[PDB]
């Protein structure tokens, strides 16, 4: 047959603090979890890798009752326990498979599980590939498999996305080591749900749990056998010997009215997911400013999250309906104190404030004018300068909105020298009145 186990074969790429990148397996990773760091190009990939590692640690702690300690590699009696059930982490097996299901008759290309790599219909620019001729190696397939429970888009027919529907912002606390990283985000619950990757589909009740929530399977998936060859994959590009070229994917809807609060999610007012409203075109009620870091810094800092826990890390995936738009991440130094709610709510309205800035015309015409488009060209540079002092801005420990208003002064003069180029006297007064534009905080 074909043998490929998660623990036995190297499929996790890390970098040690001595500067040596490497690819290692699961057993070596948690053996030396205090001496390396996960290194993935796409931030969502390393986020889902950390989430799966945390879920596995939660299950093993639930079945060993050992709490991990900081600066340790890992708690003892975890590697032998994972070696006890090594047959459960099976891929390309016979009857037991990991994160897979029954062989549905529908056949799809292996590139559907990867968002950045285009699939059938749409376009194929920025990634020159074709279906069924370009495949995935023995690690990128598991990369795509681990991305299922948290980054599943709505899609076309088959609207049902997953346990979070539209993927929201994912916020979590950072560290400098993998064993250290797990300590900050170690929050055991009252009940550790039920396993959802133990080879059981496990139809549960309305109330679900952590081990059944972090390992959701919104789509039935079955990977075909490897094909001999020499070409590299379309995701990481390393030449190999075997590749996977097709899969069996068919959509499945979650039961309606499920109760599940994501530990790393952000919700607006009624459980609706707070996504990233970043697009490419500037239209009415939106001026493109990039780096929507200010948007989720209210809801996450309002429900048992008003601590420091080191530094914060935001992972934001933006998409409309089925089409994916962007993925980015932001680090924030968050070793400050508490903040007043009003100023923080004003901070989490910068998109509307900047749109109101841009929509104001030059001399006053109203109707439906686009305002001054030359202001919209200088906004993404001034917002990148403000984001340098993003830790001080949130908690008002040395920064403020009125402090950030002075960044636009250096560039609005250069805009005004172009908008009112006359050397007369009324032009000077017009420039002086135009220079004074500042964003207005509204709720």
């Amino acid at each position: 047959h074909v043998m490929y186990n998660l623990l036995c074969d190297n499929w996790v790429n890390v970098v040690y603090l001595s500067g040596k990148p490497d690819r290692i397996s699961l057993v070596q990773t948690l053996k030396d979890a205090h001496c390396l760091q996960l290194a993935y190009s796409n931030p969502m990939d390393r986020f889902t890798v950390f989430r799966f590692l945390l879920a596995l640690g939660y299950w093993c702690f639930a079945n060993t009752n050992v709490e991990p300690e900081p600066d340790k590699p890992l708690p003892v009696s975890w590697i032998p326990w994972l070696e006890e059930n090594k047959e459960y982490f099976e891929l390309f097996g016979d009857g037991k498979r990991f994160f897979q299901a029954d062989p549905s008759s529908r056949i799809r290309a292996i590139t559907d599980l990867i968002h950045e790599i285009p699939t059938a219909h749409n376009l194929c620019h920025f990634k020159h590939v074709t279906d069924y001729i370009d495949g995935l190696c023995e690690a990128c397939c598991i990369k795509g498999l681990l991305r299922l429970p948290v980054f599943t888009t709505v899609g076309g027919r088959g609207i049902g996305a997953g346990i979070n529907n539209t993927p929201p912002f994912y916020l979590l606390w950072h560290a400098n080591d993998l064993a250290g990283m797990l300590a900050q985000n170690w929050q055991p619950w009252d009940n550790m749900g039920i396993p959802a990757w133990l080879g059981s589909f496990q139809k549960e009740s309305r109330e679900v749990g952590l081990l059944a929530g972090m390992t959701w399977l919104p789509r039935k998936v079955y990977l075909h056998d490897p094909v001999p060859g020499q070409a590299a994959c379309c995701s990481c590009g390393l030449p190999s010997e075997a590749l996977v070229y097709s899969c069996s994917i068919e959509v499945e809807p979650v039961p309606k009215g499920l109760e599940w609060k994501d530990p790393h999610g952000v919700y607006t007012d009624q459980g609706k997911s707070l996504q990233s409203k970043i697009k490419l075109m500037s239209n009415d009620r939106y001026t493109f400013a990039d780096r929507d870091w200010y948007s989720p810094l209210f809801s996450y800092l309002h429900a048992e999250g008003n601590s420091r826990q080191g530094k914060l890390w935001l992972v934001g995936f933006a998409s409309d309906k089925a089409k994916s738009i962007d993925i980015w991440d932001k680090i924030i130094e968050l070793e400050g104190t508490d903040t007043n709610d009003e100023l923080l709510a004003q901070l989490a309205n910068r998109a509307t404030a900047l749109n109101a800035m841009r929509k104001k015309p030059l001399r006053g015409d109203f109707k439906k004018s686009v305002g001054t488009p030359q202001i919209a060209d200088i906004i993404p540079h001034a917002e990148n300068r403000i984001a340098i002092n993003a830790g001080k801005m949130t908690e008002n420990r040395g920064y403020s909105w009125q402090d950030a208003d002075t960044e636009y002064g250096e560039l609005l003069t250069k805009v005004a020298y172009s908008l009112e180029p006359a050397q007369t006297v009324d032009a000077r007064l017009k420039r002086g009145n135009f220079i004074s534009r500042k964003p207005w905080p509204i709720i």
């Binding site: 015309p361 030059l362 015409d365 109707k367 004018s369 686009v370 488009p373 030359q374 020298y417 172009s418 908008l419 180029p421």
Partner: protein, 212 residues
């Protein structure tokens, strides 16, 4: 073996030869706005509901830069040097007598270059640092002449600083009927100042390999 694939690149390995850079003006941008009104052919004389709109336009003196790789073009044609020379001449004509099609049915800015300089050198360079000071117009000059003068000063400084090392540079300054010479004296700032596009294409072609 088409010219449109070898020179420009793939339709939509096959590495091309062109290096069309962004065209950047030589002075302060002066955006202007227009308050148009969508008038109604039927008089009506009722229900006004003002149709005031806004459309932005500008006028500028652009400095445009192009590069052509001769070895890459020859490898793309695999040896047809006459075809390579013909494609270079065709691009020299086209890039001089072609304008973008954006909003030309309402503004009709069908203008022509006021001076083209063709150079041959080992290292690449762009004379964008010449217009680090925006061009200010004076009484006995216009914008075009001052831009050409700043280009002449930068070329003079470069040939005073970056020259010799067993590598002389060659210029082929052109201007319509020689109305805009590139500087005065200083060995005319380049080689022959000629006043016809066909003569410029012929001069470059006969310099490259003595082509037709």
């Amino acid at each position: 073996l088409a010219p449109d694939i070898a020179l420009c690149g793939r339709m939509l390995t096959v590495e091309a030869a062109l290096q069309v850079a962004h065209a950047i003006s030589t002075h302060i941008a002066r955006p202007e706005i227009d308050y148009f009104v969508a008038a109604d052919d039927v008089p009506g004389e009722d229900a006004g509901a003002g149709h005031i709109g806004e459309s932005m336009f500008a006028s500028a003196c652009f400095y445009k830069y192009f590069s052509i790789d001769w070895e890459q073009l020859v490898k793309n044609l695999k040896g047809d040097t006459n075809l390579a020379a013909h494609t270079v001449g065709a691009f020299l004509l086209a890039a001089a007598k072609t304008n973008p099609s954006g909003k030309q049915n309402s503004f009709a800015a069908h203008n022509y270059p006021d001076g083209i300089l063709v150079e041959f050198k080992n290292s690449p360079i762009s004379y964008a640092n010449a217009f680090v000071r925006p061009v200010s117009v004076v009484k006995e000059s216009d914008l075009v002449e001052q831009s050409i003068g700043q280009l002449s000063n930068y070329v003079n400084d470069i040939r005073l600083g970056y020259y010799d090392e067993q590598s002389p540079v060659i210029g082929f300054w052109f201007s319509p009927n020689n109305r805009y010479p590139l500087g005065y004296k200083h060995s005319k700032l380049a080689s022959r100042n000629i006043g016809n596009l066909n003569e410029l294409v012929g001069a470059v072609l006969d310099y490259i390999g003595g082509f037709k």
